[PDB]
Design a protein around this ligand. Structure first.
Ligand code: CHL
Ligand code: CLA
Ligand code: CLA
Ligand code: CLA
Ligand code: CLA
Ligand code: CLA
Ligand code: CLA
Ligand code: XAT
Ligand code: XAT
Ligand code: LMU
Ligand code: LMU
Lengths: 194, 212, 165, 217
């Protein structure tokens, strides 16, 4: 067991001890049925991995000064040419959707027929970090915790943007400038009154 | 069924059995039988402490600041009515302070609730595991670091009775501030001065009849 | 408007009709005294006549070339143009009362079939029972539907007598 | 044995142990709508949905109404809010309602099939692994599970008390809404404004003098 989400509380019985990232957090008992838990265990990792790439991509765009994650796809609706690191890309919206759909369908289709493999290894582990059984146990915990943090972080980007209408890095600088003047309470939406 | 040896709010009156003197300040006062159900009375016992303890702080925080101002002690917040402190301008906006307030209170209150749900389960420091509260503490009375001076090691029963008596009086006082402030329109200590100036002609009967 | 009709409030023939009826009443009035009993009665009639023609125009009815109100029965045309009060709403008003009367009578008839002598309970009404069933009939549509779904509304084909065939 | 009318004869169908297990049973059924046990089971669900919907709706008319008067909000009258909202809206009311019927219809349909076959929505594979938590509890109309995040229904001692509070506030809320509708036509003002008028002069501002309710007088 990784830890305890609510100190002084009991751990659910249906959650195995050796399941990575197990803090005994299941207030709604959504994973009580073994069949449901198996699907959700895979989905959490898949969501985490996508979020980690998503958060990194969102921060990289703004740190390098090419815009923010929100307004990257505006050129399609506004009318313009795509860019990546500042170099023009010839494709257009129709071309991107077709290629993305085909590529994702083929790659995701292969995973779908696997049956729920979360840690394939081999071709996906060229450096063989998780080859050793003992070492893999702790790496899986590290992966999910960073993944869970990334999932929350991305939710922060979307929620914060809706309230403040600014990118993540822009908001962070604003908070540092005036910590007591710029925050969720002072954006005029998060707290109904004041 | 309540024994006649215990203090009674109304001497010579029959009183509920479930008020058997276990709780502090148990004078058998429950004309509406609110606390009849033991489960509910278990909750009401903690609610009285929480409402009482905040009331004692609130009343102290409404009289002392005004008392100092009259004595002449000067500080930037001097001369501000207890119901005008919200409008006063501080280093940070009221909204930002409110947001911090709830985040801080959310941690401590849930910590307090966890003990109430399962006593003794929230007596350990999450970070520095060496720290810990005494294992004998009961809900509503943490002790340990919350009792640095060890007063709880003396006549605890008397101290509990003294706390609830001062607390109950404090709760009534705060209701007086709202009623008096809403009616008189002035600060509490101003009302006391008016009453002392002419106690006989300054009763609430005099004051309210004049208004209507 | 609908079917070539026009609102009675805008109908020339409708307005002329009111004058004809009032003129007839006025002609009879002038053969009496100012405040005699016949005169008061005639004046009361004229007030109701004026009120009636104002109410029908205010109700937004449709008048034909005859200058008389015509009613719209199609539910679609009624709800489309706000004529629901002519036929559509009164349709469900009548059925509630008609089902009320029929349902109450059926309940009473079933109640006395259990008695020793049902025939004597029909010529001589059991008033205490009838009043009890009269009040409970207000919820007949709910009770009627629940009987239908539970299958106790209809008799079995094998328990009903029929002629040779 | 509490009853809506002391000294009256409680209907027999409401005195059965199954009937007395229902929250808020005060023997009130003069029209005999619950005589059939199968019907009473259906009408109990109707009351719960009416109760809960009415409470949410009334809270959405009353709490905004008081805060609007207190100056903390600016919300139009409940009978005008529909027109005000649709103006500064991303969709017309036709499109907004059509979506509402799909989402409500889908959710309502699942609830409907649980009344016909209790616990039938936990059919393995029917949902994307989420069917396990859609089985409901042993009491119809009290789903629990994901609908009870704080787990207040897991305390057996407080269970009967909680259900009684819901039905009592639910019945009161249902009457409140009927009062909002009747008071809008009768007085032509808001609910909170009607309360303010009554409190000013209770003995002259009431339904007995509104000129509508008692036409004969
Ligand atoms: C024990 C709890 C508690 C109580 C009983 C009060 C009671 C009061 N507060 Mg206070 N507050 C409390 C907690 C808190 N307050 C505030 C922040 C404020 C502010 C910022 C203000 C008050 C004011 C008021 C008064 C409201 C009546 C009035 O004059 O309205 C009429 C209101 C006005 C004339 C103010 C108009 C301008 C204002 C900027 C508009 C926005 C006001 C907010 C909606 C207030 C929200 C308060 C809520 C959170 C308790 C009243 C004396 C008001 C006051 O002092 O008025 C003289 C006021 O402006 N309170 C915070 C955040 C740290 C609290 C946190 O717990
Ligand atoms: C889930 C992952 C993900 C997704 C969907 C996107 C999506 C996007 N990124 Mg982002 N990005 C990500 C992760 C992601 N990024 C990460 C992890 C980084 C850090 C390395 C970046 C760094 C980055 C930059 C610096 C920029 C974008 C930009 C873009 C946009 C154009 C992409 C394009 O045309 O690529 C085309 C790519 C190729 C043709 C090459 C494919 C990859 C090769 C094979 C990698 C070889 C090693 C688009 C909105 C651009 C933008 O915001 O434009 C407005 C932009 O300037 N991204
Ligand atoms: C329920 C407890 C309670 C609460 C909610 C408040 C709340 C408040 N007090 Mg009060 N106060 C309390 C108890 C309380 N007080 C007690 C027990 C005392 C001791 C007698 C005081 C003495 C006191 C003084 C002397 C002053 C306040 C002031 C204030 C205001 C600013 C607080 C601040 O920024 O402190 C500073 C922050 C930290 C210490 C952290 C605020 C409205 C100030 C005010 O109203 O200024 C206009 C002010 O001058 N309080
Ligand atoms: C009349 C006030 C009063 C009294 C007699 C008590 C009495 C008690 N409290 Mg309680 N308490 C009070 C108010 C009071 N409390 C308030 C207002 C709060 C909220 C902050 C608390 C919060 C609290 C906690 C969290 C705990 C106690 C505990 C205790 C026990 C041991 C400490 C003691 O004897 O303090 C005696 C108190 C005094 C002599 C008060 C003197 C005046 C002080 C210095 C304040 C001056 C303010 C100034 C005028 C402005 C005892 C039963 C502990 C316990 O039960 O341990 C087992 C414990 O854990 N109390
Ligand atoms: C803690 C209790 C307490 C105390 C000591 C006072 C003191 C005072 N109040 Mg206040 N008051 C209180 C509670 C209290 N009040 C409460 C709970 C309310 C809300 C209903 C009010 C509402 C109120 C109004 C509307 C007015 C006063 C006024 C007064 C003044 C006395 C004249 C009068 O009409 O009194 C009326 C007050 C009462 C009958 C109090 C009844 C309730 C308390 C709890 C009774 C306690 C009795 C008990 C034996 C303890 C006595 C005090 C103790 C220290 C020995 C005086 C400054 C008047 C004023 O300001 O004149 C200039 C005035 O107009 N009070
Ligand atoms: C007794 C049989 C009967 C007849 C002959 C009619 C005749 C008519 N109805 Mg009515 N209607 C009836 C019964 C009938 N209705 C009933 C029982 C109901 C349900 C309570 C309705 C509900 C209804 C609505 C909601 C509408 C009509 C309309 C119409 C008109 C054109 C469409 C139509 O119904 O075509 C012939 C009728 C039938 C084949 C029988 C079934 C008719 C259904 C129920 C309604 C069809 C509406 C249609 C799809 C609307 C399309 C737009 C239209 C402008 C072309 C026509 C005058 C429409 C209208 O107002 O047109 C001006 C209209 O909008 N009716
Ligand atoms: C049956 C329940 C119900 C229904 C049908 C409505 C219907 C309506 N409400 Mg009301 N409301 C309700 C309950 C309900 N309310 C309750 C319980 C409250 C709390 C007391 C409110 C408080 C409230 C306010 C303050 C306002 C409305 C408004 C509205 C309008 C829709 C606003 C909109 O576009 O939202 C679209 C968005 C959603 C449907 C998604 C939910 C978004 C919120 C912010 C999530 C909050 C989450 C929470 C913090 C946890 C509409 C007339 C507005 C109005 O009248 O405008 C003219 C308005 O200002 N309502
Ligand atoms: C927050 C989140 C999920 C949170 C779930 C929670 C709290 C669940 C909690 C509980 O269930 C438990 C555990 C147990 C139960 O008993 C109780 C509850 C309470 C029910 C997922 C986020 C998941 C987030 C994900 C997958 C994000 C993916 C983001 C991507 C791919 C972004 C890509 C791009 O941003 C780039 C890089 C550049 C841009 O220009 C373009 C785009 C396309 C926008
Ligand atoms: C659901 C309900 C109300 C729902 C209200 C909602 C959603 C309101 C929503 C909105 O307002 C907001 C929030 C904001 C606004 O801007 C917009 C709208 C959209 C307007 C009321 C039910 C209200 C239901 C009522 C009043 C029902 C009363 C039933 C009675 C009295 C029955 C009595 C008996 O049947 C018994 C029990 C037994 C028999 O034996 C005898 C008799 C006598 C027959
Ligand atoms: C909202 C989109 C509407 C358009 C149609 C969408 C169709 C979506 C089809 C998804 C199919 C996923 O299929 C994949 O995962 C399923 C669930 O684990 C597996 O079962 C399949 O063997 C696998 O190939
Ligand atoms: C907000 C939290 C919930 C509600 C809390 C209710 C309890 C506190 C009530 C305070 O009531 C309060 O009302 C008025 C402010 O609105 C005060 O009114 C006074 O203060 C004004 C400034 O605000 C000044 O112009 C005057 O001194 C006077 O009008 C009353 O003197 C006081 O009784």
């Amino acid at each position: 067991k990784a830890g305890n989400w609510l100190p002084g509380s009991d751990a659910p019985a249906w959650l195995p001890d050796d399941l990575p990232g197990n803090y005994g957090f299941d207030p709604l008992s959504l994973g009580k049925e073994p069949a449901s838990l198996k699907r959700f265990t895979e989905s959490e990792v898949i969501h985490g991995r996508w979020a980690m790439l998503g958060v990194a991509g969102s921060l990289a765009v703004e740190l390098l000064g090419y815009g923010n994650w929100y307004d990257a796809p505006l050129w399609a609706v506004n009318g313009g040419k795509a860019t990546w690191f500042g170099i023009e890309v010839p494709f257009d919206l129709n071309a991107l959707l077709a290629f993305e759909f085909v590529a994702m369908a083929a790659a995701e289709g292969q995973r779908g027929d696997a049956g729920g493999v979360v840690y394939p290894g081999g071709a996906f582990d060229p450096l063989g970090f998780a080859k050793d059984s003992s070492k893999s146990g702790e790496l899986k915990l590290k992966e999910i915790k960073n993944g869970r943090l990334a999932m929350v972080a991305f939710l922060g980007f979307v929620a914060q943007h809706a309230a403040t209408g600014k990118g993540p890095i822009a908001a962070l600088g604003e908070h540092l400038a005036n910590p007591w003047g710029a925050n969720f309470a002072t954006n005029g939406i998060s707290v109904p009154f004041f | 069924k309540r024994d006649a040896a215990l203090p009674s709010w109304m001497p010579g009156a029959d009183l509920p059995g479930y008020l058997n003197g276990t709780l502090p300040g148990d004078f058998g006062f429950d004309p509406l039988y609110l606390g009849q159900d033991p489960v509910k009375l278990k909750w009401y016992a903690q609610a009285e402490l929480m409402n009482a303890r905040f009331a004692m702080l609130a009343v102290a925080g409404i009289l002392v600041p005004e008392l100092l101002s009259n004595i002449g002690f000067s500080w930037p917040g001097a001369g501000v009515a207890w119901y005008d402190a919200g409008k006063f301008e501080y280093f940070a906006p009221a909204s930002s302070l409110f947001g911090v307030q709830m985040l801080l209170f959310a941690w401590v209150e849930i910590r307090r609730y966890q003990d109430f749900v399962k006593p003794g389960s929230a007596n350990q420091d999450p970070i520095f595991t060496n720290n810990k509260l005494p294992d004998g503490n009961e809900p509503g009375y943490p002790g340990g670091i919350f009792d640095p001076f060890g007063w709880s090691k003396g006549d605890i029963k008397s101290l509990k009775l003294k706390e609830i008596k001062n607390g109950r009086l404090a709760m009534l006082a705060f209701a007086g501030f709202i009623g008096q402030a809403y009616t008189t329109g002035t600060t509490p200590l101003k009302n006391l001065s008016t009453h002392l100036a002419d106690p006989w002609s300054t009763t609430v009967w005099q004051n309210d009849l004049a208004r209507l | 408007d609908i079917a070539g009709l026009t609102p009675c409030s805008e109908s020339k023939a409708y307005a002329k009709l009111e004058k004809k009826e009032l003129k007839t009443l006025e002609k009879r009035l002038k053969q009496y005294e100012a405040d005699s009993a016949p005169a008061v009665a005639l004046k009361a009639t004229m007030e109701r006549t004026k009120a009636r023609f104002a109410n029908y125009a205010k109700a937004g009815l449709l008048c034909g070339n005859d200058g008389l109100p015509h009613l719209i029965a199609d539910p679609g045309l009624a709800l489309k143009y706000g004529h629901a009060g002519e036929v559509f709403i009164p349709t469900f008003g009548f059925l509630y009362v008609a089902g009320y009367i029929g349902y109450v009578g059926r309940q009473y008839l079933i109640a006395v079939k259990g008695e020793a002598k049902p025939t004597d309970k029909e010529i001589i009404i059991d008033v205490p029972l009838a009043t009890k069933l009269a009040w409970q009939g207000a919820g007949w549509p709910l009770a009627a539907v629940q009987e239908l779904q539970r299958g106790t509304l209809l008799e079995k084909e094998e328990n009903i007598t029929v002629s040779p065939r | 044995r509490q009853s809506w009318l002391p000294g009256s004869q409680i209907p027999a169908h409401l005195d059965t142990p199954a009937a007395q297990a229902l929250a808020g049973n005060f023997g009130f059924d003069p029209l005999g709508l619950g005589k059939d046990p199968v019907a009473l089971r259906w009408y109990q669900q109707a009351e719960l949905i009416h109760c809960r919907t009415a409470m949410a709706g009334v809270a959405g008319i009353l709490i905004p109404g008081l805060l609007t008067k207190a100056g903390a909000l600016n919300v139009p009258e409940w009978y005008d809010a529909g027109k005000v909202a649709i103006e500064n809206s991303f969709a017309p009311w036709g499109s907004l309602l059509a979506v509402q019927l799909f989402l409500c219809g889908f959710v309502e349909a699942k609830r409907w099939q649980d009344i016909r076959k209790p616990g039938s929505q936990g059919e393995p594979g029917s949902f994307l692994g989420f069917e396990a938590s859609l089985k409901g509890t042993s009491e119809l109309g009290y789903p629990g599970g994901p609908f009870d995040p704080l787990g207040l229904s897991k305390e057996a001692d407080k269970w009967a008390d909680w259900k009684l509070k819901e039905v009592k506030n639910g019945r009161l809320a249902m009457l409140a809404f009927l009062g909002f509708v009747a008071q809008k036509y009768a007085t032509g003002a808001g609910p909170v404004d009607n309360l303010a008028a009554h409190l000013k002069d209770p003995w002259h501002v009431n339904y007995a003098t509104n000129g509508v309710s008692l036409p004969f007088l």
